[PDB]
Amino acid sequence: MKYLPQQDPQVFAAIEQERKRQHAKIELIASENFVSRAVMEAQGSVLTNKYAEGYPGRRYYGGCEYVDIVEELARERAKQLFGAEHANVQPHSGAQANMAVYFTVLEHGDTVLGMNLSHGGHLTHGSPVNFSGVQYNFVAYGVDPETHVIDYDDVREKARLHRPKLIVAAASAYPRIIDFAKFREIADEVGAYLMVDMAHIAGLVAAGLHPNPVPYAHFVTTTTHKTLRGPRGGMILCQEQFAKQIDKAIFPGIQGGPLMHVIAAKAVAFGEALQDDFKAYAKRVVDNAKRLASALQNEGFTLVSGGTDNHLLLVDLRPQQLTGKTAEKVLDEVGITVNKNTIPYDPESPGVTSGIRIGTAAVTTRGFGLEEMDEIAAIIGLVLKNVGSEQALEEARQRVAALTD
Amino acid sequence: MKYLPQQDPQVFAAIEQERKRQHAKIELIASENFVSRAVMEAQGSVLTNKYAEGYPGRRYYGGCEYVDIVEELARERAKQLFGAEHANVQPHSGAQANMAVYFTVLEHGDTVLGMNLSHGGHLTHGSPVNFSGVQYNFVAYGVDPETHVIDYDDVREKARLHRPKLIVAAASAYPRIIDFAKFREIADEVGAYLMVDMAHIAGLVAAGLHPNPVPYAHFVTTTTHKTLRGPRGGMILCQEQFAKQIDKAIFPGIQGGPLMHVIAAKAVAFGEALQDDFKAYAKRVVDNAKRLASALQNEGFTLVSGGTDNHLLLVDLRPQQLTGKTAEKVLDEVGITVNKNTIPYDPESPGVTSGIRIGTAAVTTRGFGLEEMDEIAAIIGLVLKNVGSEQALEEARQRVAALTD
Numbered sequence: 001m002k003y004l005p006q007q008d009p010q011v012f013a014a015i016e017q018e019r020k021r022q023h024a025k026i027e028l029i030a031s032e033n034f035v036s037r038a039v040m041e042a043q044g045s046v047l048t049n050k051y052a053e054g055y056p057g058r059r060y061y062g063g064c065e066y067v068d069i070v071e072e073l074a075r076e077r078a079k080q081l082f083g084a085e086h087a088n089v090q091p092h093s094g095a096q097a098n099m100a101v102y103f104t105v106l107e108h109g110d111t112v113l114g115m116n117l118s119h120g121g122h123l124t125h126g127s128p129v130n131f132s133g134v135q136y137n138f139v140a141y142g143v144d145p146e147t148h149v150i151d152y153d154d155v156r157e158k159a160r161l162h163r164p165k166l167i168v169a170a171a172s173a174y175p176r177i178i179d180f181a182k183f184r185e186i187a188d189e190v191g192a193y194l195m196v197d198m199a200h201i202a203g204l205v206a207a208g209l210h211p212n213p214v215p216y217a218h219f220v221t222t223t224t225h226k227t228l229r230g231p232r233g234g235m236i237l238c239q240e241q242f243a244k245q246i247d248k249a250i251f252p253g254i255q256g257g258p259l260m261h262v263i264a265a266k267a268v269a270f271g272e273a274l275q276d277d278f279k280a281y282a283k284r285v286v287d288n289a290k291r292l293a294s295a296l297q298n299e300g301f302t303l304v305s306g307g308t309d310n311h312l313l314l315v316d317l318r319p320q321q322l323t324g325k326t327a328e329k330v331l332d333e334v335g336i337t338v339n340k341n342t343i344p345y346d347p348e349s350p351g352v353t354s355g356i357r358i359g360t361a362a363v364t365t366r367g368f369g370l371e372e373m374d375e376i377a378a379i380i381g382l383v384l385k386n387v388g389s390e391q392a393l394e395e396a397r398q399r400v401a402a403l404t405d
Numbered sequence: 406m407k408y409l410p411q412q413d414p415q416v417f418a419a420i421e422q423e424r425k426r427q428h429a430k431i432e433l434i435a436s437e438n439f440v441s442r443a444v445m446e447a448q449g450s451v452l453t454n455k456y457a458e459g460y461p462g463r464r465y466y467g468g469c470e471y472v473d474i475v476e477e478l479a480r481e482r483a484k485q486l487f488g489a490e491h492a493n494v495q496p497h498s499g500a501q502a503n504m505a506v507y508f509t510v511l512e513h514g515d516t517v518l519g520m521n522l523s524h525g526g527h528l529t530h531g532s533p534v535n536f537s538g539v540q541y542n543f544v545a546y547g548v549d550p551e552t553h554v555i556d557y558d559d560v561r562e563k564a565r566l567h568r569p570k571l572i573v574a575a576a577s578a579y580p581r582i583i584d585f586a587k588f589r590e591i592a593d594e595v596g597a598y599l600m601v602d603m604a605h606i607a608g609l610v611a612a613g614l615h616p617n618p619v620p621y622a623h624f625v626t627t628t629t630h631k632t633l634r635g636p637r638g639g640m641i642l643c644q645e646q647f648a649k650q651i652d653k654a655i656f657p658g659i660q661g662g663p664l665m666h667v668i669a670a671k672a673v674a675f676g677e678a679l680q681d682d683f684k685a686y687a688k689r690v691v692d693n694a695k696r697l698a699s700a701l702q703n704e705g706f707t708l709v710s711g712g713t714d715n716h717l718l719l720v721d722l723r724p725q726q727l728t729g730k731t732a733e734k735v736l737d738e739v740g741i742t743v744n745k746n747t748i749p750y751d752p753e754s755p756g757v758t759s760g761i762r763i764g765t766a767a768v769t770t771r772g773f774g775l776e777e778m779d780e781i782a783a784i785i786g787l788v789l790k791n792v793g794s795e796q797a798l799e800e801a802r803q804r805v806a807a808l809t810d
């Protein structure tokens with residue numbers, strides 16, 4: 001940076017603290033990642049200056065010839081990445097991507113079937129304090145109380161009982177592969193649309209390490225910033241038959257001017273994901289998660305679903321008689337970033353929880369491998385089995401520093 | 406840029422075209438501006454990597470200490486700028502800022518009174534193809550057919566007849582000062598909330614060149630990217646009594662993770678607006694608009710409302726027997742960017758229009774003054790009075806090039 005340090009010392013000082021923090025900590029928040037310098041440069045471009053309501057070649061402002069090239073690059077690269085017939089790269093966020101799909105196919109008060117929020121479902125999949133739960137009538141399917149795998153007979157029964165217009169599959173805290181074929185089979189039985197929110201697993205899907213929802217879902221939504229390792233934002237994929245309606249839902253439906261600089265950054269991220277080394281990266285993400293899972297079980301930890309098929313895992317802390325909140329707080333003291341997270345059938349409130357959610361996407365981006373996974377698990381064991389020992393916590397602190405340099 | 410040219414030649418080439426285009430054209434789109442290099446650097450920062458749902462000191466993720474400083478800087482600087490009791494700097498856009506206010510005070514189907522869309526009202530002020538018009542029952546007030554000034558007796562009559570729960574004031578194409586006191590007086594008469602959407606005039610308000618809606622409105626919404634000359638995004642200002650509800654509407658109501666890098670850029674832009682030279686800039690914007698208005702009238706053009714009090718003007722092209730669409734197209738041929746725009750009581754469809762909308766914020770940022778305003782008006786006259794003359798258009802093309810270098 002050249003101009004920000006001179007123009008705004010206060011903002012620059014805070015940014016520099018944040019940059020240094022990102023390097024110093026072991027970042028295990030499952031939704032986080034580190035974008036490339038190319039992605040950030042695209043976000044820091046003059047494209048922020050351009051109003052471009054509408055779509056490439058169909059804008060409501062003149063002078064969009066070049067931002068059109070950018071948006072089209074993003075759309076085409078996304079279509080190659082996921083094998084989708086249509087892409088909308090304009091959603092400002094995962095929230096807005098989901099909002100737009102709901103706006104497309106639902107009327108106020110329509111019934112929607114989504115994953116139980118306390119079992120892994122997202123806020124935008126029917127929370128009564130979110131637009132989704134306020135605007136539509138959400139019902140929920142659950143995971144099995146023992147296996148913690150989605151109960152597809154429960155999805156089916158809820159769908160047949162409640163007759164939703166839309167079924168939502170996908171999650172913010174589900175560590176196993178989702179069977180999109182079964183979701184579409186159930187949707188077909190009850191005459192419902194199927195929406196898949198692949199936000200967490202999008203990079204894995206792109207790398208062929210999770211089944212692709214595109215051939216099964218009428219609509220696929222996602223963020224660009226989780227396993228896909230792109231800028232912060234959303235995207236919708238859909239069959240050509242829904243393209244016009246989806247585009248109209250985004251604009252003029254729920255947004256105005258798109259963030260063209262962020263769309264440029266999306267294109268860059270998609271370009272990166274199309275490369276062979278991204279496929280290798282994504283495999284290391286999953287390999288690392290499985291290794292981390294195994295190493296945690298070696299420490300004596302119980303994992304929700306007994307492990308992981310993806311980038312993320314959920315520790316059920318009840319055997320250690322710890323809450324997620326306690327674990328999150330103490331791990332913060334030693335430089336390990338996790339979040340407290342409700343586990344399926346959690347006896348604790350969402351403000352307290354019995355679990356922590358952990359993901360490997362960020363640490364993998366930094367170059368961490370299997371040996372680092374073993375060490376991270378050993379540090380977590382040291383901390384959570386010795387929460388009352390300042391000497392243990394100082395050792396953990398030193399071992400975290402050794403990992404991050 | 407260092408890494409983008411190497412990583413993504415396609416995206417870089419398009420961005421470079423866009424950068425050069427922004428320099429070459431006379432940019433008169435009233436909603437556009439050119440942000441500082443400091444603003445862009447903040448947007449191009451590692452802050453994109455951070456999930457920070459919630460608010461400063463009240464986040465749902467650990468490690469937000471530094472992004473908290475950034476967001477708080479943005480909020481406090483906004484409060485100083487506008488004299489507001491509370492700021493929410495998280496809205497992804499003007500669309501989302503408006504959406505959140507509606508979500509706060511309205512239920513599905515509630516009546517809202519906004520400015521007639523064909524008289525200057527925005528898409529998000531009740532368009533039947535926008536969430537606003539689909540979700541709520543919008544009614545409209547108009548401007549006087551002769552003066553083109555908001556008819557406050559019409560605002561009052563519509564409010565008394567329809568009994569809206571909310572009245573919206575402010576516009577995307579209104580060239581005169583809005584009387585917020587009268588809007589609040591009417592709101593008070595009928596027991597309605599008052600929302601002011603100051604998106605277009607926010608920089609002028611910040612510089613004391615337009616009356617401040619803050620003391621009159623329950624909610625003030627705005628974009629950060631028009632006259633305020635900041636990054637692309639939204640903001641809500643409100644009285645302390647509504648702070649909790651507004652914050653909850655943004656999250657968990659209608660958004661998820663905020664764009665912390667964009668919020669950093671907001672803070673920078675607000676820092677700039679707090680400086681004396683921004684006040685001088687904003688005065689030149691208004692001075693230039695008045696000069697441009699006068700010079701266009703000198704060319705024989707009729708202006709909606711007979712001129713301007715702000716940054717923007719609307720040419721009524723009926724005397725020249727031209728549509729806005731024709732004017733927009735031919736001006737594009739010579740390197741002058743405007744938009745076609747419906748005028749009040751327009752006999753043409755919104756796809757055709759009888760007007761063009763012009764604003765001076767962008768050209769003023771580039772250093773253009775009164776002499777440049779005279780020349781821009783003379784070029785517009787040359788073009789629009791000689792649409793069939795390729796020699797006139799080539800002269801205009803050369804005169805535009807002379808202005809931009």
Ligand SMILES: Cc1ncc(COP(=O)(O)O)c(CN[C@H](C(=O)O)[C@H](C)O)c1O
Binds near residue numbers: 031
């Ligand atoms: C599955 C899923 N869909 C949408 C979103 C929201 O995206 P955005 O924040 O851009 O609006 C999420 C967000 N996930 C967060 C996380 O996993 O940490 C949190 C649960 O909201 C999501 O997971």
Ligand SMILES: Cc1ncc(COP(=O)(O)O)c(CN[C@H](C(=O)O)[C@H](C)O)c1O
Binds near residue numbers: 500527603639
């Ligand atoms: C008065 C007003 N409010 C909201 C918006 C939408 O902001 P965003 O594009 O960030 O969602 C606008 C947008 N204005 C555009 C323009 O003036 O060119 C256009 C009319 O939508 C606005 O003017």
